[PDB]
Amino acid sequence: SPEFVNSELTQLDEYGEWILEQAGEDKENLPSDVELYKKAAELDVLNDPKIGCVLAQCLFDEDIVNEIAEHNAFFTKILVTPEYEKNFMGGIERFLGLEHKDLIPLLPKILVQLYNNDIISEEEIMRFGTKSSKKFVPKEVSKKVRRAAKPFITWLETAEL
Numbered sequence: 001s002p003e004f005v006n007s008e009l010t011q012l013d014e015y016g017e018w019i020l021e022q023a024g025e026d027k028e029n030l031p032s033d034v035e036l037y038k039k040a041a042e043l044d045v046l047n048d049p050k051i052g053c054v055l056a057q058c059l060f061d062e063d064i065v066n067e068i069a070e071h072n073a074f075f076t077k078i079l080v081t082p083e084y085e086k087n088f089m090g091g092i093e094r095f096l097g098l099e100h101k102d103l104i105p106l107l108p109k110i111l112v113q114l115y116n117n118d119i120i121s122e123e124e125i126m127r128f129g130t131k132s133s134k135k136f137v138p139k140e141v142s143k144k145v146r147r148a149a150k151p152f153i154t155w156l157e158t159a160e161l
Contacts, residue, residue: 012054015043019058027061033074049083056091065106069113085124090136097141108152129153
């Protein structure tokens, strides 16, 4: 069951696995944002931009649209550079593309939530919706997921009682 030898990747894995185990199948027992931050500090993963990727894969389920805007202060404290945001988008890509393909149609609404709450920058959303990448998922999976962003990307591009 456990990893036997420690690494930066095993620390990320241990953080994600702790979230998953704590949270339950319906994310009904998610640790509080205070607990999520303190555990990240304990496991020494705050300084790793890939923490964004882990969080995006562990916090959410089919109710992602309703959940993704419920951690604003936490994301301001965690996603401390654009590389953390890029990795968060990669985690969304893995979440939608690999194990929850039925949720891919939610991508534009997910982007609307991230945009309206300034969780992810316009630049990072544009990057995600205009390029495919092999970095987070296989190329064909990347194309499938990112193509679903198109209506929001088009909206971004063309954007008294």
